[PDB]
Amino acid sequence: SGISLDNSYKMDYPEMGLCIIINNKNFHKSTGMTSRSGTDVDAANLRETFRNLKYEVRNKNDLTREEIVELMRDVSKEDHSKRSSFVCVLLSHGEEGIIFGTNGPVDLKKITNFFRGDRCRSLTGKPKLFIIQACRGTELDCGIET
Amino acid sequence: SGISLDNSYKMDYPEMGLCIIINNKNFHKSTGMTSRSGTDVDAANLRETFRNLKYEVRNKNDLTREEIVELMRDVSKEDHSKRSSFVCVLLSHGEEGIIFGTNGPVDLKKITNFFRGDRCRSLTGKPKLFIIQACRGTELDCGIET
Amino acid sequence: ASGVDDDMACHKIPVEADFLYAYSTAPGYYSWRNSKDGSWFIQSLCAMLKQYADKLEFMHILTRVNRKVATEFESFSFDATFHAKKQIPCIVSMLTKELYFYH
Amino acid sequence: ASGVDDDMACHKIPVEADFLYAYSTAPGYYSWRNSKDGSWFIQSLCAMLKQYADKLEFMHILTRVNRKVATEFESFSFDATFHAKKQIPCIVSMLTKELYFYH
Amino acid sequence: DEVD
Amino acid sequence: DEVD
């Protein structure tokens, strides 16, 4: 054949891949965390958007930290061989490096480590996209007039 | 005129901008930090590369933490109005969020804050590129065979 | 040329390669959400994917998301501490190729 | 549409906007340097800018740098702890436009 | 407007 | 090879 350049990920596998959306709106009262009004708007918008890109969208609402970890472990153990890519969207409270389950925090690294190239071999070489709507601390940006 | 889209930074100002290279090779013995053999190769390669892109390259070697902060403060107080962009390259030891002067650490945020949109008004709206060759911790990546 | 650290016989990639993290906000900062319309970031992300996913590489789409969030939104709060604030998303790419959602 | 947080009368941008951080390595990781040839990242960055700065947008150049570092380099060490290790650079973009070094 |  |  002609010249081959390999500058773009192969996105013509049979399936685009999974789009897992974790939508945490309501937190256990014990945690002190507020309900996240507007997050269902986000989750619905994402489902539509990723549906139109031909992802297999799976939504989960109001997961505990243990449920988040179980979900990601289970998803990482699926056979992704026929999938081009993987997307995970996290909608929750957060701090730098942390996302909240409904009962407490999860380190983001614990979640992403399931998808490392050595631990999820059917995603090795494939793009793994994590979209994170959560705080990363407490700083506020005052902006500048342009 | 015809339709205008504004999707790319304006890079046709009279000057491309400054490229400041901080090349820390030799550390005060009191710090315990090793000499960074090979860093001069890097610094020379950068100077050439950015010269060919028409940047005004300024190199500094073996700066203390106080000298790093003074340099960046002074550079941020120049008039960049006729410059398209700003580049800073840091070659040193580091840890997450930190770069080393020859006598101790500097928080990267202290350095970049001088160039915030509200603090360096002649760079507001212009790209500010920080290129950082430094450790970010102590983890090692074992890789995976492909 | 020849050296100790290139041209391995057995090809490996980093285990951290081929990740992209599309964060809603810069490190250390709050992220903003409208209780009625959704988060600034997700609203903007979905709008830009709808418009551009058949046309632009993903980093370029995310750059348009950055611009939209940065320019179009500013907080409103009865609390002066939290009023008139801004947000810039933060794209963290460990990708090794361009990503297009189409082929 | 109408709401509290869009279409401000006075245009502001975030103070953190329009920064790009091209880190040599992923968060938490060591970064590798060859004592003779220079750092894996800087050697690769300069090579990709030489080749592509008159041709590609900067995020795309940095993606090629990611690929080069990830695929071409692997450490050599007499210390087994430090031997046969890999590196992926990390592009952190708060840019709001495409960046081309040419016009 | 609320923060996360 | 050395680390930074």
Coordinates of C-alpha atoms in Angstrom, one line a residue:
Chain A
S1 CA 0.0 0.0 0.0
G2 CA 0.8 3.6 0.1
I3 CA 2.5 5.6 2.8
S4 CA 1.0 5.0 6.3
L5 CA 1.5 7.8 8.9
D6 CA -0.1 6.7 12.2
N7 CA -0.7 10.2 13.6
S8 CA -4.3 9.5 14.8
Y9 CA -5.9 6.9 17.0
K10 CA -7.8 4.2 15.2
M11 CA -11.4 5.1 15.8
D12 CA -13.0 2.6 13.4
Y13 CA -13.3 -0.4 15.6
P14 CA -16.8 -2.0 15.7
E15 CA -17.7 0.1 18.7
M16 CA -16.6 3.6 19.8
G17 CA -16.5 2.4 23.4
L18 CA -18.2 2.9 26.7
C19 CA -19.1 6.3 28.1
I20 CA -19.6 5.8 31.9
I21 CA -21.3 8.7 33.6
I22 CA -21.2 8.9 37.4
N23 CA -23.7 11.5 38.5
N24 CA -23.6 12.2 42.2
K25 CA -26.3 14.6 43.2
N26 CA -27.4 13.6 46.7
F27 CA -24.8 12.9 49.5
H28 CA -25.3 11.1 52.7
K29 CA -26.3 13.6 55.5
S30 CA -23.4 12.3 57.6
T31 CA -20.9 13.8 55.1
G32 CA -22.1 17.4 55.3
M33 CA -22.0 17.7 51.6
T34 CA -24.6 19.7 49.7
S35 CA -26.9 18.4 47.0
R36 CA -25.6 19.3 43.5
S37 CA -28.6 21.0 41.8
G38 CA -28.2 21.1 38.1
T39 CA -26.2 17.9 37.8
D40 CA -29.1 16.0 36.2
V41 CA -29.1 18.6 33.4
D42 CA -25.4 17.9 32.9
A43 CA -25.9 14.1 33.0
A44 CA -28.7 14.2 30.4
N45 CA -26.8 16.5 28.2
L46 CA -23.8 14.2 28.3
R47 CA -25.8 11.1 27.5
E48 CA -27.3 12.8 24.5
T49 CA -24.0 14.2 23.3
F50 CA -22.1 10.9 23.6
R51 CA -25.0 8.9 22.1
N52 CA -24.7 11.0 19.0
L53 CA -21.0 10.2 18.9
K54 CA -22.0 6.5 19.0
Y55 CA -20.7 5.7 22.5
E56 CA -22.5 3.1 24.7
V57 CA -23.5 5.3 27.5
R58 CA -24.1 3.9 30.9
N59 CA -25.3 6.2 33.7
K60 CA -25.0 5.7 37.4
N61 CA -26.5 8.0 40.0
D62 CA -25.6 8.6 43.6
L63 CA -22.8 6.0 44.1
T64 CA -20.9 5.4 47.3
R65 CA -17.1 5.4 47.2
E66 CA -17.2 1.6 47.4
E67 CA -19.7 1.5 44.5
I68 CA -17.5 3.8 42.4
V69 CA -14.5 1.6 42.9
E70 CA -16.5 -1.6 42.2
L71 CA -17.9 -0.1 39.0
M72 CA -14.6 1.0 37.7
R73 CA -13.0 -2.3 38.6
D74 CA -15.7 -4.2 36.8
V75 CA -15.7 -2.0 33.7
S76 CA -11.9 -2.3 33.5
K77 CA -12.3 -6.1 33.5
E78 CA -14.6 -6.1 30.5
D79 CA -13.2 -7.1 27.1
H80 CA -12.7 -3.8 25.3
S81 CA -11.0 -5.4 22.3
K82 CA -13.7 -4.3 19.8
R83 CA -13.9 -0.8 21.3
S84 CA -12.0 2.2 20.0
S85 CA -11.8 4.2 23.2
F86 CA -13.1 4.6 26.8
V87 CA -14.8 7.6 28.4
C88 CA -15.6 8.2 32.0
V89 CA -17.4 11.3 33.2
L90 CA -17.4 12.2 36.9
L91 CA -19.9 14.7 38.2
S92 CA -19.5 15.3 42.0
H93 CA -18.0 17.2 44.8
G94 CA -14.2 17.1 44.8
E95 CA -10.9 18.4 46.0
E96 CA -7.5 18.3 44.3
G97 CA -7.0 14.7 43.2
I98 CA -10.2 13.5 44.8
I99 CA -13.8 12.8 43.8
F100 CA -16.6 12.3 46.3
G101 CA -18.8 9.3 46.5
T102 CA -22.0 9.9 48.3
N103 CA -20.4 8.7 51.6
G104 CA -16.9 10.0 51.2
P105 CA -13.9 10.6 49.0
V106 CA -12.2 8.4 46.3
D107 CA -8.7 9.3 45.0
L108 CA -8.9 9.9 41.3
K109 CA -5.7 7.8 40.9
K110 CA -7.4 4.8 42.4
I111 CA -10.1 5.1 39.6
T112 CA -7.7 5.8 36.7
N113 CA -5.2 3.1 37.8
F114 CA -7.7 0.4 36.8
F115 CA -7.2 1.5 33.2
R116 CA -3.4 1.7 33.2
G117 CA -1.9 0.2 30.1
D118 CA -0.6 -2.8 32.1
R119 CA -3.9 -3.4 34.0
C120 CA -6.5 -3.1 31.2
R121 CA -4.8 -4.8 28.3
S122 CA -7.8 -4.5 25.9
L123 CA -7.5 -0.6 26.2
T124 CA -3.7 -0.5 25.8
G125 CA -2.9 1.9 23.0
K126 CA -6.4 3.3 23.0
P127 CA -7.5 6.7 24.3
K128 CA -8.9 6.8 27.8
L129 CA -10.8 10.0 28.5
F130 CA -11.7 11.2 32.0
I131 CA -14.0 14.2 32.1
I132 CA -14.1 15.7 35.6
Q133 CA -16.7 18.2 36.8
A134 CA -15.6 18.7 40.4
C135 CA -13.8 21.3 42.5
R136 CA -10.0 21.1 42.7
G137 CA -9.7 23.2 45.8
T138 CA -11.0 26.5 47.2
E139 CA -9.4 29.2 45.1
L140 CA -11.5 31.7 43.3
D141 CA -10.5 33.4 40.0
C142 CA -11.2 37.2 40.1
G143 CA -10.6 37.6 36.4
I144 CA -9.3 40.6 34.6
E145 CA -11.2 43.0 32.4
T146 CA -10.2 42.8 28.7
Chain B
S1 CA -14.0 42.9 5.5
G2 CA -14.8 39.3 5.2
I3 CA -15.7 36.9 8.0
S4 CA -13.3 36.9 10.9
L5 CA -13.0 33.8 13.2
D6 CA -10.6 34.4 16.0
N7 CA -9.6 30.7 16.6
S8 CA -5.8 31.3 16.8
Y9 CA -3.7 33.5 18.8
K10 CA -2.3 36.6 17.0
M11 CA 1.4 35.7 16.4
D12 CA 2.3 38.5 14.0
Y13 CA 3.2 41.1 16.6
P14 CA 6.6 42.8 15.8
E15 CA 8.3 40.3 18.2
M16 CA 7.5 36.6 18.9
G17 CA 8.5 37.3 22.5
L18 CA 11.0 36.2 25.1
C19 CA 12.2 32.7 25.7
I20 CA 13.8 32.6 29.1
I21 CA 15.8 29.5 29.8
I22 CA 16.8 28.7 33.5
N23 CA 19.4 26.1 33.4
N24 CA 20.4 24.8 36.8
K25 CA 23.2 22.3 36.5
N26 CA 25.3 22.8 39.8
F27 CA 23.6 22.9 43.2
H28 CA 25.0 24.2 46.4
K29 CA 26.7 21.4 48.3
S30 CA 24.5 22.2 51.4
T31 CA 21.4 21.1 49.5
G32 CA 22.5 17.6 48.8
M33 CA 21.4 17.8 45.2
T34 CA 23.3 16.2 42.4
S35 CA 24.7 17.9 39.4
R36 CA 22.5 17.6 36.3
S37 CA 24.9 16.2 33.6
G38 CA 23.4 16.7 30.2
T39 CA 21.4 19.8 31.0
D40 CA 23.8 22.1 29.0
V41 CA 23.0 19.9 25.9
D42 CA 19.3 20.7 26.6
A43 CA 19.9 24.4 27.1
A44 CA 21.9 24.7 23.9
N45 CA 19.3 22.8 21.9
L46 CA 16.5 25.0 23.2
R47 CA 18.4 28.2 22.5
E48 CA 18.8 27.0 18.9
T49 CA 15.3 25.8 18.5
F50 CA 13.7 28.9 19.8
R51 CA 16.1 31.2 17.9
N52 CA 14.8 29.6 14.7
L53 CA 11.3 30.4 15.8
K54 CA 12.3 34.0 16.2
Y55 CA 12.2 34.2 20.0
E56 CA 14.5 36.5 21.9
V57 CA 16.3 33.8 24.0
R58 CA 17.8 34.7 27.3
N59 CA 19.7 32.0 29.2
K60 CA 20.5 32.0 32.8
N61 CA 22.6 29.4 34.5
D62 CA 22.7 28.2 38.1
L63 CA 20.3 30.5 39.8
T64 CA 19.4 30.6 43.4
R65 CA 15.8 30.5 44.4
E66 CA 16.0 34.2 45.1
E67 CA 17.5 34.9 41.7
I68 CA 14.8 32.8 40.0
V69 CA 12.1 34.9 41.7
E70 CA 13.8 38.2 40.9
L71 CA 14.3 37.3 37.3
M72 CA 10.7 36.3 36.8
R73 CA 9.5 39.4 38.6
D74 CA 11.7 41.6 36.5
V75 CA 10.7 39.9 33.3
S76 CA 7.0 40.1 34.2
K77 CA 7.4 43.9 34.7
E78 CA 8.8 44.5 31.1
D79 CA 6.6 45.9 28.5
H80 CA 5.5 42.9 26.4
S81 CA 3.0 45.0 24.3
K82 CA 4.9 44.3 21.0
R83 CA 5.4 40.6 21.8
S84 CA 3.1 37.8 20.7
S85 CA 3.8 35.4 23.5
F86 CA 6.1 34.4 26.4
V87 CA 8.1 31.2 26.9
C88 CA 9.9 30.1 30.0
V89 CA 11.9 26.9 30.2
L90 CA 12.9 25.5 33.6
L91 CA 15.6 22.9 33.7
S92 CA 16.3 21.7 37.3
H93 CA 15.6 19.2 40.0
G94 CA 12.0 19.3 41.1
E95 CA 9.1 17.7 43.0
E96 CA 5.4 18.0 42.4
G97 CA 4.7 21.7 42.1
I98 CA 8.3 22.8 42.9
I99 CA 11.4 23.6 40.9
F100 CA 14.8 23.9 42.6
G101 CA 17.1 26.9 42.7
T102 CA 20.7 26.0 43.4
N103 CA 20.0 26.7 47.1
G104 CA 16.5 25.4 47.6
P105 CA 13.0 25.1 46.2
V106 CA 10.7 27.6 44.5
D107 CA 6.9 26.9 44.2
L108 CA 6.1 26.9 40.5
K109 CA 2.9 28.9 41.3
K110 CA 5.1 31.7 42.7
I111 CA 6.8 31.8 39.3
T112 CA 3.7 31.6 37.1
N113 CA 1.7 34.0 39.3
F114 CA 3.8 36.9 38.0
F115 CA 2.3 36.3 34.6
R116 CA -1.3 36.1 35.6
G117 CA -3.6 38.0 33.4
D118 CA -4.2 40.7 36.1
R119 CA -0.5 41.0 37.1
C120 CA 1.2 41.2 33.7
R121 CA -1.2 43.2 31.6
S122 CA 1.0 43.4 28.5
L123 CA 0.6 39.6 28.3
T124 CA -3.1 39.4 28.9
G125 CA -4.7 37.4 26.2
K126 CA -1.4 36.2 24.9
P127 CA -0.1 32.6 25.3
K128 CA 2.3 32.0 28.2
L129 CA 4.2 28.8 27.8
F130 CA 6.1 27.1 30.6
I131 CA 8.2 24.1 29.7
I132 CA 9.3 22.2 32.7
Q133 CA 12.1 19.5 32.7
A134 CA 12.1 18.4 36.4
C135 CA 10.9 15.5 38.5
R136 CA 7.3 15.6 39.8
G137 CA 7.8 13.0 42.5
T138 CA 9.4 9.6 42.8
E139 CA 7.2 7.2 40.9
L140 CA 8.7 5.0 38.2
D141 CA 6.7 3.8 35.1
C142 CA 7.3 0.1 34.4
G143 CA 5.7 0.3 31.1
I144 CA 3.8 -2.4 29.2
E145 CA 5.0 -4.4 26.2
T146 CA 3.0 -3.6 23.1
Chain C
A1 CA 24.0 7.4 16.9
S2 CA 23.8 4.8 19.8
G3 CA 23.1 4.9 23.5
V4 CA 21.7 3.1 26.4
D5 CA 18.1 4.3 26.4
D6 CA 16.8 4.2 22.9
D7 CA 15.9 1.6 20.2
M8 CA 14.8 -1.2 22.6
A9 CA 14.4 -4.6 21.2
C10 CA 11.0 -5.1 22.9
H11 CA 8.7 -2.2 22.4
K12 CA 7.0 -0.9 25.6
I13 CA 4.8 2.1 26.2
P14 CA 4.3 3.9 29.6
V15 CA 1.4 2.6 31.6
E16 CA 0.3 6.2 32.1
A17 CA 0.2 6.9 28.3
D18 CA -3.0 7.4 26.3
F19 CA -4.9 9.2 29.1
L20 CA -6.6 12.5 28.7
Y21 CA -8.1 14.3 31.7
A22 CA -10.5 17.1 30.8
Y23 CA -10.8 19.0 34.1
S24 CA -13.5 21.6 34.6
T25 CA -11.2 24.0 36.4
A26 CA -7.6 24.8 37.1
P27 CA -5.6 23.1 39.8
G28 CA -6.6 24.4 43.2
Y29 CA -9.8 26.2 42.2
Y30 CA -13.4 25.8 42.8
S31 CA -15.6 24.7 39.8
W32 CA -18.9 26.5 39.1
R33 CA -22.3 25.1 38.5
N34 CA -25.6 26.8 37.7
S35 CA -28.3 25.1 39.8
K36 CA -30.8 25.4 36.9
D37 CA -28.6 25.1 33.7
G38 CA -25.9 22.8 34.8
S39 CA -22.2 23.2 35.1
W40 CA -20.4 25.8 33.1
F41 CA -17.9 23.2 31.9
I42 CA -20.3 20.4 31.0
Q43 CA -22.7 22.7 29.2
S44 CA -19.9 24.1 27.2
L45 CA -18.3 20.7 26.5
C46 CA -21.5 19.3 25.2
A47 CA -22.1 22.4 23.0
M48 CA -18.7 22.2 21.5
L49 CA -18.9 18.5 20.9
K50 CA -22.3 18.9 19.2
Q51 CA -20.9 21.6 17.0
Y52 CA -17.4 20.3 16.2
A53 CA -17.0 16.6 16.8
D54 CA -17.5 15.9 13.1
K55 CA -14.9 18.6 12.2
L56 CA -12.1 19.2 14.7
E57 CA -9.5 17.1 16.6
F58 CA -10.4 16.7 20.2
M59 CA -7.7 18.9 21.7
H60 CA -9.0 21.7 19.4
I61 CA -12.6 21.1 20.6
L62 CA -11.4 21.3 24.2
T63 CA -9.6 24.5 23.4
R64 CA -12.9 25.9 22.2
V65 CA -14.5 24.7 25.5
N66 CA -11.8 26.6 27.4
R67 CA -12.5 29.8 25.4
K68 CA -16.3 29.4 25.9
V69 CA -16.0 28.9 29.7
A70 CA -13.4 31.6 30.1
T71 CA -15.3 34.3 28.1
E72 CA -19.0 33.6 28.5
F73 CA -19.5 32.9 32.2
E74 CA -19.0 34.9 35.4
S75 CA -20.5 34.0 38.8
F76 CA -23.4 35.8 40.5
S77 CA -23.6 35.6 44.2
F78 CA -25.2 37.5 47.0
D79 CA -21.9 36.8 48.9
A80 CA -19.3 39.2 47.8
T81 CA -16.6 36.5 48.3
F82 CA -18.1 34.4 45.6
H83 CA -19.4 37.1 43.3
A84 CA -18.0 38.0 39.8
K85 CA -15.6 35.0 39.6
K86 CA -14.3 33.3 36.5
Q87 CA -13.2 29.8 35.5
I88 CA -10.7 28.2 33.1
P89 CA -10.9 24.5 32.4
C90 CA -7.7 22.5 32.3
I91 CA -6.8 20.0 29.6
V92 CA -4.3 17.4 30.8
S93 CA -3.1 15.3 27.9
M94 CA -0.9 12.2 28.0
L95 CA -2.3 11.2 24.6
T96 CA 0.2 10.0 21.9
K97 CA -1.9 10.6 18.8
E98 CA -4.6 12.9 17.5
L99 CA -8.1 12.0 18.4
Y100 CA -11.0 12.4 16.0
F101 CA -14.4 11.0 16.8
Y102 CA -15.1 10.4 13.1
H103 CA -13.3 8.4 10.5
Chain D
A1 CA -32.3 32.4 27.2
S2 CA -31.3 34.5 30.2
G3 CA -29.6 33.8 33.5
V4 CA -27.3 35.2 36.2
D5 CA -23.9 34.1 34.9
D6 CA -23.6 34.8 31.2
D7 CA -23.5 37.8 28.9
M8 CA -21.8 40.2 31.3
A9 CA -21.7 43.8 30.4
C10 CA -17.9 44.0 31.0
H11 CA -15.9 41.3 29.5
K12 CA -13.4 39.5 31.9
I13 CA -11.2 36.5 31.3
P14 CA -9.8 34.3 34.1
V15 CA -6.4 35.3 35.4
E16 CA -5.3 31.7 34.9
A17 CA -6.3 31.6 31.2
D18 CA -3.8 31.5 28.4
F19 CA -1.2 29.4 30.1
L20 CA 0.2 26.2 28.8
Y21 CA 2.5 23.9 30.9
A22 CA 4.5 21.4 29.0
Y23 CA 5.7 19.1 31.7
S24 CA 8.3 16.5 31.0
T25 CA 6.6 13.7 33.0
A26 CA 3.3 12.7 34.5
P27 CA 2.2 14.0 37.9
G28 CA 4.0 12.1 40.7
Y29 CA 6.8 10.7 38.5
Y30 CA 10.5 11.0 38.1
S31 CA 11.7 12.6 34.8
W32 CA 14.7 11.0 33.0
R33 CA 17.8 12.6 31.7
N34 CA 20.7 11.1 29.7
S35 CA 23.9 12.5 31.1
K36 CA 25.5 12.7 27.6
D37 CA 22.5 13.4 25.3
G38 CA 20.2 15.5 27.5
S39 CA 16.7 15.0 28.8
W40 CA 14.4 12.7 26.9
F41 CA 11.7 15.4 26.9
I42 CA 13.8 18.4 25.8
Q43 CA 15.6 16.4 23.1
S44 CA 12.2 15.3 21.8
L45 CA 10.6 18.7 22.1
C46 CA 13.4 20.4 20.2
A47 CA 13.3 17.7 17.5
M48 CA 9.5 18.0 17.0
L49 CA 9.6 21.8 17.0
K50 CA 12.4 21.7 14.3
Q51 CA 10.3 19.3 12.2
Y52 CA 6.8 20.7 12.7
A53 CA 6.7 24.2 13.9
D54 CA 6.1 25.6 10.4
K55 CA 3.4 22.9 9.9
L56 CA 1.3 21.9 12.9
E57 CA -0.5 23.6 15.8
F58 CA 1.4 23.5 19.0
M59 CA -0.8 20.9 20.9
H60 CA -0.4 18.6 17.9
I61 CA 3.4 19.1 18.1
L62 CA 3.3 18.3 21.8
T63 CA 1.3 15.2 21.1
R64 CA 4.1 14.1 18.8
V65 CA 6.6 14.8 21.6
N66 CA 4.5 12.6 23.9
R67 CA 4.6 9.8 21.3
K68 CA 8.3 10.1 20.8
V69 CA 9.2 10.1 24.5
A70 CA 6.7 7.2 25.2
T71 CA 7.9 5.0 22.4
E72 CA 11.6 5.6 21.8
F73 CA 13.1 5.8 25.3
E74 CA 13.5 3.3 28.1
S75 CA 15.9 3.7 31.0
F76 CA 19.1 1.7 31.5
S77 CA 20.4 1.3 35.1
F78 CA 22.7 -1.0 36.9
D79 CA 20.1 -0.6 39.7
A80 CA 17.2 -2.9 39.1
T81 CA 14.8 -0.4 40.8
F82 CA 15.6 2.2 38.1
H83 CA 16.1 -0.1 35.1
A84 CA 13.7 -0.5 32.1
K85 CA 11.5 2.4 33.0
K86 CA 9.3 4.6 30.8
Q87 CA 8.1 8.2 30.6
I88 CA 5.1 10.0 29.3
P89 CA 5.1 13.9 29.2
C90 CA 2.1 15.8 30.4
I91 CA 0.5 18.6 28.5
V92 CA -1.5 21.0 30.7
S93 CA -3.4 23.5 28.6
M94 CA -5.4 26.5 29.8
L95 CA -5.1 28.0 26.4
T96 CA -8.2 29.5 24.7
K97 CA -7.0 29.5 21.1
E98 CA -4.9 27.5 18.7
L99 CA -1.2 28.4 18.7
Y100 CA 0.8 28.4 15.5
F101 CA 4.4 29.7 15.6
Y102 CA 4.0 30.9 11.9
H103 CA 1.6 33.2 10.3
Chain E
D1 CA -24.4 29.7 40.9
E2 CA -22.9 27.1 43.3
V3 CA -19.5 25.7 43.7
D4 CA -18.5 21.9 43.6
Chain F
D1 CA 20.4 7.7 32.6
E2 CA 19.7 9.8 35.7
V3 CA 16.5 11.1 37.3
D4 CA 15.6 14.8 38.0

